Automatic annotation (TrEMBL), chain B:
Domain CRISPR type III-associated protein: 9-222
GO terms classed as biological process: defense response to virus
Keywords, in A-Z order: Antiviral defense
PANTHER family, alphabetized: CRISPR SYSTEM CMS ENDORIBONUCLEASE CSM3, DUF324 DOMAIN-CONTAINING PROTEIN
Pfam families linked: RAMPs
Record protein name field: CRISPR-associated Cas7 paralog (Type III-D)
Automatic annotation (TrEMBL), chain C:
Record protein name field: CRISPR-associated small subunit protein (Type III-D)
Lineage of producing organism: Archaea, Thermoproteota, Thermoprotei, Sulfolobales, Sulfolobaceae
Organism: Saccharolobus solfataricus
Superkingdom as given in the UniProt entry: Archaea
Automatic annotation (TrEMBL), chain D:
Keywords tagged on the record: Antiviral defense
Organism phylogeny: Archaea, Thermoproteota, Thermoprotei, Sulfolobales, Sulfolobaceae
Source organism (scientific name): Saccharolobus solfataricus
The keyword DNA-binding is assigned to this record: no
GO terms under biological process: defense response to virus
Designated name of the protein: CRISPR-associated Cas7 paralog (Type III-D)
InterPro entries, sorted: CRISPR-assoc_RAMP_Csx7, CRISPR_Csm3_endoribonuclease, RAMP_III_fam
Domain CRISPR type III-associated protein: from-to ranges: 40-209
NCBIfam families per the UniProt record, alphabetical: cas_cyan_RAMP
Pfam families in UniProt: RAMPs
Automatic annotation (TrEMBL), chain E:
Protein's UniProt name: CRISPR-associated small subunit protein (Type III-D)
Superkingdom field: Archaea
Species of provenance: Saccharolobus solfataricus (Sulfolobus solfataricus)
Length: 238, 251, 120, 239, 121, 122
């Protein structure tokens, strides 16, 4: 759809406080700073959440939301499907079926309008937990499946920064390609209050990020793009 | 007096001077030699130097092809009777019968001969023409090429992005060659000890101009140095020329 | 350089354990990994030195090895400390995996000499 | 008449260092073209990572086109790249102008703002493989697995840009005034906000920001040996 | 030159790994890619030597191959080390893709000899 | 002429269709030979080019027999003749691809003049 005319630039910058201990994987590579065969990824002794993982989690949550919407006007298509299009409007009228995840996070035929940066940590602390299994017969024996994993401390600030283009949030869009602003607001509300689950284990509670507070700065192209137009706290937005 | 120069340029990244580029489009081919490999033609050097000199001079007369004003025939006759070399040039060009030793022979003159004389006057009264020559002017500057024994050629592909949707436009895959280099050596002989030439070299010292194609895309940007490059001034023909650092001549 | 210090301390820690049924290092890799984990968790040098001293007092750490570690980490930044500890852990792992004999590495003081010895 | 390249009035050269804020990934035009590194390697000039001039020019042109369309002015338009019927300026009787065509040229007109390449004198290349595949089941499919190479933040690139016949300091008039204003807007955006360029921009890969710049203005034919004014770009963009 | 060193190193690294139920070289392409990536990221030669020593001690790199690598990568520039590692990676990949038997290839110590062997059959 | 014969033998070796393919594609791709030429140009070293083609053969991206013939031909060549041979190979391969000539037509043509005789007849 329309991407060459940058109308609204929305910047969200806040702190991601890790609720429960978080573990993100890596390509099994080795470094002096770690002693575990499967450590967590970090840049120069600074554990961080890669923007790719946040993008994937957000896309999955938005896809689940869209499919739960249960409407024909908004659909979700397979990642590896070559026959999917972001929009398929036809003049039978102006009715058209759009793909909210494709609109926000892009697709093979459309770039993403939601830029998500990484998130490095400041008051981090790496904690190692050792877990072993229990043989069901002769309960208590450790069958040698003793695996120790690295984690982050339960509570540490993360530098979060996200960019959204051509999607007014403070003012919102009237009806044009709507239900995407609503989906983004729902995702932000879930992230702020509940917080999404990211990480390696993600089933034993390992990895639960949360956004405590974030200033929402809106930059509009015509009047002043460098100078922010409206700056508000994320809580008032939702 | 003959001024001899051996200029060296520490160009950023590489340069590219194409030619022919076969058919079928696809990639862009930099011009070859067959034996020496690759080179920069002397004509390209002369064109770049003419552009730089025109920038330096900033002469409004040169901008309009020296065709903006009507030159009185009395002034032409005065110059002809005052300049022997100009008279010789005019006689060699328009013909001895047309232009006598003293006078213009208006009866034999016509429209095109008068236009040729006016153009010759205008161009002879222009430093750029006097240096680089013209359709009838002698010239004044000789530039050699810069054939490089090195043949390190890498390929820098490019793709166009659809503005409506940020993705590759599956219409073409632009491919551009590039000749990486660090010191381009060009020998330049100038037979006109012109302050215009010194000013042009001075401008190349600090600002520096581009050479070759796709200069708008970071391909080709030379800057003259005062350390490797050297010059030599020849006034006597009974002595071996001596080369010294270009800084003394330019600074 | 930090690597020279790391090689020296690993050599001091690879000394044979006296009064042992089998020829084994006086210091175990579990101790080194515990040092790394403790430094990462606590993120300070003072209690790291305290833990090193407590371990040394409770055997499993050579007295000269503990002295060298204390001298090295007496005044060091957190990043420098973790870099040194990682280098020490890697060098100790190399020595253990290669089953290098202690008597052939009693005179090495740098990292280059150890590399040459390993290569030859 | 916007085809004034014959007469050069002033030349300004902008020299600065470009430092990436995020994990800058070079364009890597070497698609499936390994030279001396693993998998698909980022392009580099003699083992030195290099930001392509074409990439920066394309990003700048996209930004300028977005700004011009946001202007919503009849006098200023942008034409499609594939269209061959576009013209730079129209002198029909006040006229229309194309700001991106004025700045970076078109088929009918060459560029006015040259952009050079950039090399990081202090570069730090890192690799980060990512499987990144989940489905209804939630596992990882081995087919979808890829690795990428990133230049770590804190790498300063030698950046130089030249502009012809535009007084970024003294200011201009008529269409040249609008062109200078657009250039000032682009420079301010680059200095303060930054520009994404390179790999996937959704994930925060590639964000350059100009740290410090020197603007040297030259006026022909008198002041060409040395610039009349060398002023910080910070004091030029905001006055 | 460097190519001969790289060929000898690749031949040493391609020897069959004992106590492995499947026919495979002693080392894996993942190890070579990790070597190159570590050298690129750390930009240090001594750290690369430490990495090589630890990989050898992990019972996954042949001790002769490790000795060859350590002998080659000492008193050597970073650029030369990068070139040697790239040559080693390319030769190893070629040998793996061609499924060259180690038995009839362990007797060559020159890159030109390997080229002749490949060209002949 | 003789280099032309060498190049056309290489091209007819490379025109062998790639099996288990959805489309009737040649075993060797145009991008592959273009990469060969570009790598030789940038890296002025015959041994490095030999290593490159060997790696490509091991990558199952070029024909094993064509790789064998290339290695045998360029085993002891200089650089000036190597670049000419690669250029001729590019020319003949492009001609074959554009003309839509199948392998069964050329089959085992040894002389370039016979190939152009076939092209003139066809």
């Amino acid at each position: 759809m329309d991407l060459d005319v940058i109308t609204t630039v929305v910047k969200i910058e806040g702190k991601l406080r890790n609720e429960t201990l978080l573990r993100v994987g890596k390509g099994k590579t080795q470094d002096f700073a770690e002693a575990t065969d499967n450590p967590i990824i970090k840049y120069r002794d600074r554990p961080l959440i890669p923007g790719s993982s946040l993008k994937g989690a957000f896309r999955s949550l938005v896809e689940s939301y869209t499919k739960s919407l249960n409407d024909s006007k908004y659909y979700v298509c397979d990642l590896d499907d070559n026959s999917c299009v972001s929009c398929e409007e036809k003049k039978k009228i102006v009715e058209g079926r759009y793909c909210i995840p494709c609109i926000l996070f892009g697709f093979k035929d459309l770039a993403s309008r939601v830029y998500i940066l990484d998130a490095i940590a400041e008051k981090y602390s790496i904690s190692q937990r050792t877990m072993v299994a229990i043989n069901r017969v002769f309960g208590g024996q450790m069958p040698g499946h003793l695996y120790t994993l690295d984690y982050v401390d339960p509570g540490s600030e993360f530098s979060f920064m996200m960019m959204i283009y051509n999607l007014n949030l403070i003012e919102g869009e009237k009806d044009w390609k709507a239900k995407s602003v609503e989906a983004l607001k729902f995702l932000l509300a879930t992230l702020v209050r509940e917080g999404i689950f990211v990480g390696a284990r993600k089933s034993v509670g390992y990895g639960l990020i949360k956004l405590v507070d974030a200033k929402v700065s809106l930059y509009k192209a015509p009047d002043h793009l460098v100078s922010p137009v409206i700056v508000k706290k994320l809580e008032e937005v939702i | 007096v003959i001024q001899v120069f051996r200029l060296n340029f520490r160009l950023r990244t590489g340069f590219r001077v194409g030619g022919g580029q076969e058919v079928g489009d696809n990639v862009i081919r930099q011009l070859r030699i067959g034996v020496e490999g690759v080179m920069i033609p002397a004509s390209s050097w002369k064109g770049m130097f003419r552009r730089v000199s025109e920038i330096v001079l900033n002469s409004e007369d040169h901008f309009e092809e020296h065709s903006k004003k009507e030159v009185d025939t009395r002034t032409i006759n005065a110059l002809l009777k005052s300049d022997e070399k100009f008279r010789r040039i005019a006689i060699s060009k328009v013909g001895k019968e047309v232009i006598t030793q003293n006078g213009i022979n208006v009866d034999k003159l016509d429209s095109e001969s008068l236009s040729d004389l006016r153009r010759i006057y205008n161009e002879y009264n222009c430093p750029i023409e006097r240096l680089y020559g013209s359709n009838y002017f002698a010239g004044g500057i000789t530039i050699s090429d810069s054939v490089i024994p090195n043949a390190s050629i890498m390929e820098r592909t490019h793709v166009t992005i659809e503005r409506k949707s940020k993705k590759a436009s599956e219409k073409h895959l632009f491919s551009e060659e590039i000749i990486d280099a660090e010191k381009i050596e060009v020998k330049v002989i100038v037979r006109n000890e012109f302050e215009l030439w010194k000013n042009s070299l001075k401008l190349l010292r600090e600002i520096g101009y581009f050479i070759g194609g796709s200069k708008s895309r970071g391909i080709g940007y030379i800057v003259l140095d005062e350390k490797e490059s050297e010059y030599a001034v020849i006034n006597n023909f009974s002595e071996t020329p001596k080369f010294s650092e270009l800084k003394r001549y330019l600074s | 350089d930090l690597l020279d210090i790391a090689t020296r301390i690993a050599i001091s820690a690879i000394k044979p354990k006296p009064k042992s049924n089998k020829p084994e290092p006086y210091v175990d890799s579990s101790t080194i990994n515990s040092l790394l984990s403790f430094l990462q968790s606590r993120r300070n040098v003072n209690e790291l030195l305290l833990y090193i001293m407590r371990q040394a007092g409770r055997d499993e750490i050579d007295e000269e090895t503990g002295k060298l570690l204390l001298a090295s980490l007496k005044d060091r930044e957190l990043k420098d400390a973790v870099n040194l500890l990682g280098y020490v852990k890697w060098v100790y792992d190399t020595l253990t995996g290669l089953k290098v004999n202690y008597n052939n590495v009693k005179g090495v003081k740098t990292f280059k000499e150890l590399v040459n010895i390993l290569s030859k």
